[PDB]
C-alpha cells in the first residue's frame, strides 16, 4: 500500500535516504536509509522485501544489493551482483529478481543476472541483444520487457522481451521515441514508458504498449519533462516520481489515471531525486 522512493541524486548529493508515500494521506515520510548512497539504482519487491540493486554512490559503480524489511524498518545486505551495475533495470518474475543491463563504470552492459532468494545468489541468464544502460524494465504475462536505454553510442527506441522458459530475448515493437533514463510500469495489460531522454531532449511524453497488437501508442503527457524518473503502479494509478527536467532535479510527483487519460500532481518528495528507484509494497 505504500510507494517507496529509494536513493537518487538531488543535484548535489547521491542519496542514501528513502521515503514512502501513503496515498490515503497523500504525503511522504522518511523511512530507514540505505547503507550506501545509490543513484541510478534498480528497485524491486519480492515476498515482502524491497531490494535496492546496484547504482552509483558518487565515486563507485556498485555491485552491492540490500533488502528492506518494513516490519523491522531496516536494510540488510544480501548477495552482490557478479557485475557492478548503475542505470540498471530490475524486475521480478516467478520468484526471481532480474538485474538487466546497466553500466559497470567502463562498459554499457548487455548482460543479465537473476537473484534466487532461497539460495541468496545471483546467476547469469541470457544477455540482451543490445547493451542498455538507463533501461526501463517491467514484467507482463510471463515476459520481462527491456525498454529503451543507451548502448554507449545511441539512445534507444528498441525493446526486447525475455522468455524464462526459453532463456532468450526477442525483439518486439520499438518505441515511437528514443528513451534512455525512462521509467516503465505495467497496468491492466499495458506497459507504459514514461519520460526519459531522446539524445537531445528530456521528455514529457508517455507511450503504452499493447502486447496483443505488438504496438506502442501515445497517451497523455506528463506535466513536467522527466528523465531518470521512477515509476510505480498502485491501485489503478501510475506514479511518476522525481527525475530531471533538463534544468532541475525534481521533487515533484504526478499520477496517471488511465480512465481519464490524464496526469495530476500529488504530494512532492521531501528531497529532489533523479535516478531514483521506486517500488510498491
Secondary structural class: mainly beta
Task: Estimate the strand proportion.
Answer: 35-45%
Read across the widest sheet, the strand sequence of neighbours is 3-2-1-24
The end-to-end span amounts to 6 Å
Number of domains: 1
CATH architecture: 6 Propeller
Helix coverage percent? under 10%
For CATH, the homologous superfamily is named as Kelch-type beta propeller
Oligomer: monomer
Morphology:
globular
Number of β-strand runs = 24
Number of helices: 0
* CATH fold label: Neuraminidase
- Give the CATH level 1 class: Mainly Beta
Task: Tell me about this structure.
The PDB classes it as unknown function. The entry lists the keywords beta propeller, synthetic, designer, layer, self-assembly, unknown function. The assembly is monomeric. The protein has 281 residues and is mostly beta strands. It has a single domain, classed as Kelch-type beta propeller (Neuraminidase, 6 Propeller). Helix content is 0%, strand content 42%. It is built from no helices and 24 strands. It has a four-stranded antiparallel sheet, with no helix packed on it.
Question: Which key phrases capture this entry?
Answer:
4-stranded antiparallel β-sheet, 42% strand, Neuraminidase, 281 residues, mainly beta
Amino acid at each position: 500500500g505504500l510507494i517507496y522512493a529509494v536513493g537518487g541524486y538531488d543535484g548535489n548529493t547521491h542519496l542514501n535516504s528513502v521515503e514512502a508515500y501513503d496515498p490515503e494521506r497523500n504525503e511522504w515520510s522518511l523511512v530507514a536509509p540505505l547503507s550506501t548512497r545509490r543513484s541510478g539504482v534498480g528497485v524491486a519487491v519480492l515476498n515482502g522485501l524491497i531490494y535496492a540493486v546496484g547504482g552509483y554512490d558518487g565515486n563507485t559503480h556498485l555491485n552491492s544489493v540490500e533488502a528492506y524489511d518494513p516490519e523491522r524498518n531496516e536494510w540488510s545486505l544480501v548477495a552482490p551482483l557478479s557485475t557492478r551495475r548503475s542505470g540498471v533495470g530490475v524486475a521480478v518474475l516467478n520468484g526471481l529478481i532480474y538485474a538487466v543491463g546497466g553500466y559497470d563504470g567502463n562498459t554499457h552492459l548487455n548482460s543479465v543476472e537473476a537473484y534466487d532468494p532461497e539460495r541468496n545468489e545471483w546467476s547469469l541468464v541470457a544477455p540482451l541483444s543490445t547493451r542498455r544502460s538507463g533501461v526501463g524494465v517491467a514484467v507482463l504475462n510471463g515476459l520481462i520487457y527491456a525498454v529503451g536505454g543507451y548502448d554507449g553510442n545511441t539512445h534507444l527506441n528498441s525493446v526486447e522481451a525475455y522468455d524464462p522458459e526459453r532463456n532468450e530475448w526477442s525483439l518486439v515493437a520499438p518505441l515511437s521515441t528514443r528513451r534512455s533514463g525512462v521509467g516503465v510500469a505495467v497496468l491492466n495489460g499495458l506497459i507504459y514508458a514514461v519520460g526519459g531522454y531522446d539524445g537531445n531532449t528530456h521528455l514529457n511524453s508517455v507511450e503504452a504498449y499493447d502486447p496483443e497488437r505488438n504496438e506502442w501508442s501515445l497517451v497523455a503527457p506528463l506535466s513536467t519533462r522527466r528523465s531518470g524518473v521512477g515509476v510505480a503502479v498502485l491501485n489503478g494509478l501510475i506514479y511518476a516520481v522525481g527525475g530531471y527536467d533538463g534544468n532541475t532535479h525534481l521533487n515533484s510527483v504526478e499520477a496517471y489515471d488511465p480512465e481519464r487519460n490524464e496526469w495530476s500532481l500529488v504530494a512532492p518528495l521531501s528531497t529532489r531525486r533523479s535516478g531514483v528507484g521506486v517500488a510498491v509494497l
